[PDB]
Scaffold this active site. Sequence first.
Site, PDB file in Angstrom:
ATOM      1  N   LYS A 188      44.831   2.715   5.965  1.00 25.81           N
ATOM      2  CA  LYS A 188      45.899   2.846   6.953  1.00 25.81           C
ATOM      3  C   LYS A 188      46.918   1.743   6.651  1.00 25.81           C
ATOM      4  O   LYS A 188      47.443   1.062   7.538  1.00 25.81           O
ATOM      5  CB  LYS A 188      45.321   2.736   8.373  1.00 25.81           C
ATOM      6  CG  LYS A 188      46.285   3.158   9.516  1.00 25.81           C
ATOM      7  CD  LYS A 188      46.927   4.557   9.331  1.00 25.81           C
ATOM      8  CE  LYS A 188      48.047   4.775  10.353  1.00 25.81           C
ATOM      9  NZ  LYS A 188      49.076   5.799  10.009  1.00 25.81           N
ATOM     10  N   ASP A 241      33.392   5.243   8.719  1.00 23.33           N
ATOM     11  CA  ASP A 241      32.551   5.748   9.771  1.00 23.33           C
ATOM     12  C   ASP A 241      33.129   7.024  10.369  1.00 23.33           C
ATOM     13  O   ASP A 241      32.447   8.044  10.410  1.00 23.33           O
ATOM     14  CB  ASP A 241      32.377   4.665  10.843  1.00 23.33           C
ATOM     15  CG  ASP A 241      31.372   5.046  11.899  1.00 23.33           C
ATOM     16  OD1 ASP A 241      30.477   5.867  11.609  1.00 23.33           O
ATOM     17  OD2 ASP A 241      31.450   4.500  13.009  1.00 23.33           O
ATOM     18  N   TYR A 258      34.198  -4.100  12.408  1.00 21.14           N
ATOM     19  CA  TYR A 258      32.779  -3.896  12.626  1.00 21.14           C
ATOM     20  C   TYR A 258      31.980  -5.104  12.226  1.00 21.14           C
ATOM     21  O   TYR A 258      30.764  -5.025  12.201  1.00 21.14           O
ATOM     22  CB  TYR A 258      32.266  -2.757  11.740  1.00 21.14           C
ATOM     23  CG  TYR A 258      32.507  -1.342  12.192  1.00 21.14           C
ATOM     24  CD1 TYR A 258      33.654  -0.983  12.891  1.00 21.14           C
ATOM     25  CD2 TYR A 258      31.601  -0.344  11.865  1.00 21.14           C
ATOM     26  CE1 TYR A 258      33.866   0.345  13.290  1.00 21.14           C
ATOM     27  CE2 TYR A 258      31.802   0.975  12.248  1.00 21.14           C
ATOM     28  CZ  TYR A 258      32.942   1.313  12.955  1.00 21.14           C
ATOM     29  OH  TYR A 258      33.155   2.627  13.332  1.00 21.14           O
ATOM     30  N   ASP A 310      44.651   8.332   8.986  1.00 26.95           N
ATOM     31  CA  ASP A 310      44.896   9.330  10.063  1.00 26.95           C
ATOM     32  C   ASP A 310      45.285  10.741   9.595  1.00 26.95           C
ATOM     33  O   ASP A 310      45.190  11.667  10.385  1.00 26.95           O
ATOM     34  CB  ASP A 310      45.908   8.850  11.111  1.00 26.95           C
ATOM     35  CG  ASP A 310      47.303   8.660  10.541  1.00 26.95           C
ATOM     36  OD1 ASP A 310      47.410   8.348   9.336  1.00 26.95           O
ATOM     37  OD2 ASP A 310      48.300   8.783  11.302  1.00 26.95           O
TER      38      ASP A 310
HETATM   39 CL    CL Z   1      26.908   6.632  13.696  1.00 35.20          CL
HETATM   40 CL    CL Z   2      51.401  10.117  12.184  1.00 39.72          CL
HETATM   41 ZN    ZN Z   3      48.787   9.572  12.882  1.00 39.70          ZN
HETATM   42 ZN    ZN Z   4      29.484   6.947  13.094  1.00 41.33          ZN
END
Ligand code: CL
Ligand code: CL
Ligand code: ZN
Ligand code: ZN
Lengths: 412, 412
Positions: free
Chosen positions: A223, A301, A156, A277
Amino acid sequence: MQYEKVKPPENGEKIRYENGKLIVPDNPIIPYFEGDGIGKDVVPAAIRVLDAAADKIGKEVVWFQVYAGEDAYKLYGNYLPDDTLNAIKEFRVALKGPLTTPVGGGYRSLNVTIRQVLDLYANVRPVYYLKGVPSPIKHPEKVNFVIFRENTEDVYAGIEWPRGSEEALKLIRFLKNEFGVTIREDSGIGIKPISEFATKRLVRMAIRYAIENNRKSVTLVHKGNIMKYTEGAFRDWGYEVAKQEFGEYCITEDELWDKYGGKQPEGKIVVKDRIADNMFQQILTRTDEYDVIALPNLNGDYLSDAAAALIGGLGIAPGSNIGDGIGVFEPVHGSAPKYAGQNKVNPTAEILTGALMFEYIGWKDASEMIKKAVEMTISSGIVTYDIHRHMGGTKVGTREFAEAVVENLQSL
Amino acid sequence: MQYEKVKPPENGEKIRYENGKLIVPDNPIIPYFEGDGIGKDVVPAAIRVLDAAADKIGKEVVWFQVYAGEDAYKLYGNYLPDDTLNAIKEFRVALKGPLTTPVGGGYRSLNVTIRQVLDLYANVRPVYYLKGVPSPIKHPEKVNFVIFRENTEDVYAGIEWPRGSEEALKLIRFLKNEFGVTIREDSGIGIKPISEFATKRLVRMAIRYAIENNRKSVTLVHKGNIMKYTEGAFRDWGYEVAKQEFGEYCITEDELWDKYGGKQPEGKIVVKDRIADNMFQQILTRTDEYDVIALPNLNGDYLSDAAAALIGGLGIAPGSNIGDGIGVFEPVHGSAPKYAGQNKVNPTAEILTGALMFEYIGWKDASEMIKKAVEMTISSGIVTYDIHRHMGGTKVGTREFAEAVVENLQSL
Ligand SMILES: [Cl-]
Ligand SMILES: [Cl-]
Ligand SMILES: [Zn+2]
Ligand SMILES: [Zn+2]
Ligand SMILES: [Cl-]
Ligand SMILES: [Zn+2]
Ligand SMILES: [Zn+2]
Ligand SMILES: [Zn+2]
Ligand SMILES: [Zn+2]
Ligand SMILES: [Zn+2]
Ligand SMILES: [Zn+2]
Ligand SMILES: [Zn+2]
C-alpha cells in the site's frame, strides 16, 4: 539432542540443512503434536493419510510424538516445553495440530513463541480449489496461488500503548517536541516497523520458490502509495532483491512489455507489484494472472483469508510457518472446544497441510497424490458435517472420512 | 460569502444546517464541478438524470458551476481555488467529478485538501447490486451494505519516516531506551493513532444513518484481537457510543438472543462486531447478515474495495465524503485521461453518486427512482462499452446512456 520426558525413535533419520539446501532421507523422523481439542482427532487422520501417501511412493515417515498444550501442562507443568521446541530445532519439520491460548496469554501466544524461538519468518499459504468443495464464486477453478507473508513485523508486532497511559502520553508529547507532529491526546497508539532485512528475506524466499517450482510470476503487494516509507519500501526492497540477486531469472513488467513485446520467455519469472486495496478485485477477475504473491504482515493476512473464501473457506485452509531450513505445519483454523462432540470435525485442513509438509520435504509427487485423493473423496459425496452443508444427503465421521481418502490414494 | 471569479445562481435557496439537521428547500442551490478528463462527460450526464428525478418529484436543483483541476488552473492559477471551497462551505453539498492530482504532490492530494479544509471525516460508500452488471459471485443481489470508514487517522494519516533518516533513528532509539522495545534500525517507521474523538464521530453517524434509513445492523470491523489498543479501542469506543448514546435503539447480539429469542423487533438495531480479516469470508458467505459497516481507515478501504468487487467493481462505485451537515459526493474512479471527450465512459458511478447525494438531502424516493432507472437500463442491455465487454447488449455512448435512464425514470 538431549531429551527429557520423551526420546526420539530408534528407527529414524534426521533431515539435514547445509548451505541453504535441505537434505532429506527416505525415512525422515518428523515430530508432531496433536495439540488441543479438535487436534486429537484431525492429526491422527492426517497421519494415516500421509502414511499411505508415503508408502505409495516407496518411502516411510517415522513419527515422533512430542507435546504441547494441555497434554504438556499435564506432563511437564508447562504448555510449550523445551523438548518440543528442541525436537523441531533438531528435526526441522513438524506437523502440528491447533493450540489453545491458556488463561492469561495474548491471542495465539504459544504459536507466537514457536515462530520466535525457531525463527520462522514466513507464513506460507497455498490457495487452490478442489472439485466438489462449495464455493461462493463462479470460477474457483482458476484460483492457484502461493502466498508468502512476512510474519515478524508491521502493526502485528504488538508494539502499541493504550490511550491515556504514561507511555502513550510520552510518545505523543515526544513526537510533538521533536518532529512537530500533533496526535490528539485521547489517542491509543501503535507503531508500524518494516525492515530491509526482514522484507528482503521473505521476498528472497518467494522468488526462490518461483524459480524452483517454475511459477510464472511473483507479485509484490503493498500500500506504498499512501504508506511510502513502510509499504513503499517493501516494494522497493522486493524489487532490489529481484534486480540485484536474481537478474538471471527476474524481469519487471516494464521489461516484459518493451524488451519482450509482452512474450514470457522460458526460464524468466515476472516480478510485478499491485496496490493492496486493489488485490481483492484482482483475485476475483484476473485470477488467472497471479501465482506467487509476496506481502507484508497485515496484507498477507487479509489477502490470504480473502483468497481462501473463494476456494471453500478457512476451515479447509492449509498453512505453514517457515524459516531457514526449518518448517512447522498446521491448518490455518483454531481448536474449537465442542466440535459437536467427538469424531465430527473436518480433517481436510490437516490432511492438506500434511500435503504441504511433503512439498517442502521434496516429495511433491506424494503431495499431489494427497490433493487428488482428498478431491476424489469430496467429489464422491463422502463428507463430514461442514461440507454436507451445500450438498446435503450424505454424511460420515472424521475417522471414516480419512479412511475413505486412504481408499482413493492406494487407487492409482 | 465572497466570490472572486464566479457568481452564485440567481434563483435558488441555500440548504440550511440547524440543530443536527439539513433543511432543504424545493429549489436548493448545489455547487458542482466537472473535474478532469472523464469529468467533462459523466458529470453532465449525471446532471441530466438528477434534473429528471428532481422534476418528477416536485423539486429543482439550482446548479452552481465552480472549478477544480486544469480548468481551475487556467481560470485561476490555482488547481483548487477559494470560490470552490467556499461554494461548498456556503451551500453545504456538492457533486464532483474526479481530479488528477497534478505533477508531484500530496497523493490523491486535491481530494485530500478538500476533505481537510472542509473537515469531511467520514468516507461513506453504498455497495449494492444492479441486475445486468457482471459479477464474479453466485448471489450478488444479496449485497446491500453501506460502509462508513473513518478517514482522518490510522496508518493512512502518513506519520512516517524512512529507514536511517535522523527522524526515524531518533524514534527507534527513544523506543529502545524508554519502553525497552527493540526495533531494527534498517526499518522505516510509521505510527497508527486511533482516538476517541475520531472514532465516536464515525460510529455516531453510522448508527444515525441506520436509524434514519431502517437498516437492521451496524457491524464494527476491527483487528482488535492482535491490536488491543488501537483497533480494540475502536471496537470498545463504538460499543460505548451504541450503549451510551443510542440505548433506546441498539441491542448487542447477546441481547438479541436473551431478550428477543433471536428475532429482531422492528426498530431495534443490532450492534455487533467482527474481526477484520474474517470479514472477506463473511461478505461472501453470510452476505445477507451485514448492512451498515463501520471501520477505521485502512480496514474501511480494503473492505469497501473488496465489497465493490463482488458487485461489478470500482468502476461503478458511488462515493461520498461527509462531515457535520456537509457532504461532497464523488465517484470512486479516477479521471482516466485517455477517453476524455469521446462520449465513451460509463456515467453510472456519477449517476449513482448523484443518487447518494439525493438521500443525503432527504429526497429518498428520487434516490430510489434513480437506482431503479439505472438497473432497468442495464438489465435491458443498454450499456456503455465497459459492461458491453462482458455482457454484450447495445453499445451506447455516455449521453445516450443518460438519455436512456431518463426515459426509464419517467415510466416509473
Ligand atoms: Cl487468522
Ligand atoms: Cl481506491
Ligand atoms: Zn481503496
Ligand atoms: Zn487471518
Ligand atoms: Cl484563488
Ligand atoms: Zn469457471
Ligand atoms: Zn541493503
Ligand atoms: Zn538499495
Ligand atoms: Zn464411526
Ligand atoms: Zn414542494
Ligand atoms: Zn471515554
Ligand atoms: Zn452489441
